[PDB]
Amino acid sequence: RPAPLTLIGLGPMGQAMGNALLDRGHGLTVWNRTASRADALVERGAVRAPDVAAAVAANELVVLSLTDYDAMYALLGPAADALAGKVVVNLSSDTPEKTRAGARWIAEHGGTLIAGGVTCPPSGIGSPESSAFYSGPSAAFERHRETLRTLTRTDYRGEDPGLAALWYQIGMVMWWNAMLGYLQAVALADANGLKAADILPHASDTVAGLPFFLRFYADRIDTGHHGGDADRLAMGTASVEHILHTMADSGVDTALPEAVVAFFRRGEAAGYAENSFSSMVELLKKP
């Protein structure tokens, strides 16, 4: 039987979360700084709380979908003394350190923070294939897990609130870097009469073969094997210089390929030319 809950934060993720909760039949109380972002949900049956404090008071479960944890202090700070007995499921990105700071704040005001990292876009909220990392007090998470199953599948990573944020950041460094490479490929294509649609099949093939290299290098990096049997860093330095010069010749911004070339040059200056590019995970483990 769908338990009622409050949702604060109605950007792309929160609007989708509200629609999924209203589809399962959860009594929903919503609040958003931009009051107009709640209009469609309230027309579908969501209750518009007149203020943030009334949203927190409406239910024990308060789900937050905000840009970061500073936004949580900005919205919940005025009525922080009424956070007693409340379970705050923060589905906002932040560092493990700031996520732990938010958990301390909520606890010092009588509440319980469960940290969440949703690994799906808005279109994936409510879909069975979607998942979210969850960390923080086990008992409070277990009590509200069934409601959270409406949004995504739940993946508990442990009692430390910082864990859900670490696992989110581990995936997002891969996602953002891959997507910035796509934006760079689309720009190179544009300068050469090619649209994103023209490069889509090749771009999709490039990313669809990446799991092979993830396993290939995982086994080796863990065993400390950085041999140049499949690849040598010097060949990669040339490849990335070719990218930089190809983009500059085509009039495309070079700031991001210049940083890549700088990284490969630091690997050669460390004596890794005949080793795999994987050898540079050692430069990364260094502050």
203-222: contacts with ligand NDP (CB under 6 A) = none
Phi-psi region at 11: left, alpha or beta (left = phi > 0; alpha = psi -120 to 50): beta
Q: Is 116 in the site for ligand NDP (CB under 6 A)?
A: no
Closest distance of CB 205 from ligand Q0R, Å:
9
| Residue of 195, 225, 265, 271 that binds a second copy (CB under 8 A) | 195
Q: Taking a C-beta distance cutoff of 8 angstroms, is the pair 136, 164 a contact?
A: yes
| DSSP track, 69-123 | HHHHHHHHSTTGGG-TT-EEEE-----HHHHHHHHHHHHHTT-EEEEEEE-S-GG
- Angstrom distance (rounded) from CA 180 to CA 160: 31
Asked if 265 is part of the footprint of a second copy (rule: CB under 8 A), the reply reads no
One residue of 7, 47, 66, 88 binding ligand NDP per CB under 6 A: 66
Does the footprint of ligand NDP cover residue 10 (CB under 6 A)?
yes
Could you say which of ligand Q0R, ligand NDP, a second copy, none residue 27 binds, taking C-beta under 5 to 8 angstroms by partner kind? none
Which of residues 61 and 91 has its CB atom nearest to ligand NDP in the complex? 91
d(CA 273, CA 271): 6
Tokens of 107: 């606890």
Alpha helix stretches (DSSP H) within the chain: 12-24, 39-43, 52-58, 69-76, 96-108, 138-151, 162-190, 196-208, 210-223, 233-249, 255-268, 281-284
| Residue with smallest beta-carbon separation from ligand Q0R | 231
Stretch that binds ligand NDP, among 91-99, 193-201, 203-211, 244-252 (CB under 6 A): 91-99
Q: Which of a second copy, ligand Q0R, ligand NDP, none does residue 202 bind (CB under 5 to 8 Å by kind)? A: a second copy
Contact criterion met (CB below 8 Å) for 57 and 82: yes
Distance separating alpha carbons of residues 286 and 62, to the nearest angstrom: 40
Restricting to residues 210-249, name those near a second copy by CB under 8 A.
210-219, 221-222, 228-232, 234-236, 238-240, 242-243, 245-247, 249
Question: Least distance from C-beta 208 to ligand Q0R, angstroms?
Answer: 10
* C-beta separation of 182 from 204 below 8 A: no
Query: Which residues of this chain interact with ligand Q0R, rule CB under 6 A?
Result: 119-121, 172, 175, 209, 230-231, 236
> Is the Cβ of residue 86 or residue 100 nearer to a second copy in the bound state?
100
Q: Does 49 bind ligand NDP (CB under 6 A)?
A: no
In degrees, to the nearest 5, what angle opens at C-alpha 177 toward C-alphas 179 and 287? 170
CA distance 63 to 5: 8
Does 24 contact a second copy by CB under 8 A?
A: yes
For residue 216, the minimal CB distance to ligand Q0R (Å) is 9
Interface residues toward ligand NDP, by CB under 6 A: 9-14, 32-34, 37, 65-67, 71, 74-75, 91-93, 118, 121-122, 230-232, 235, 239
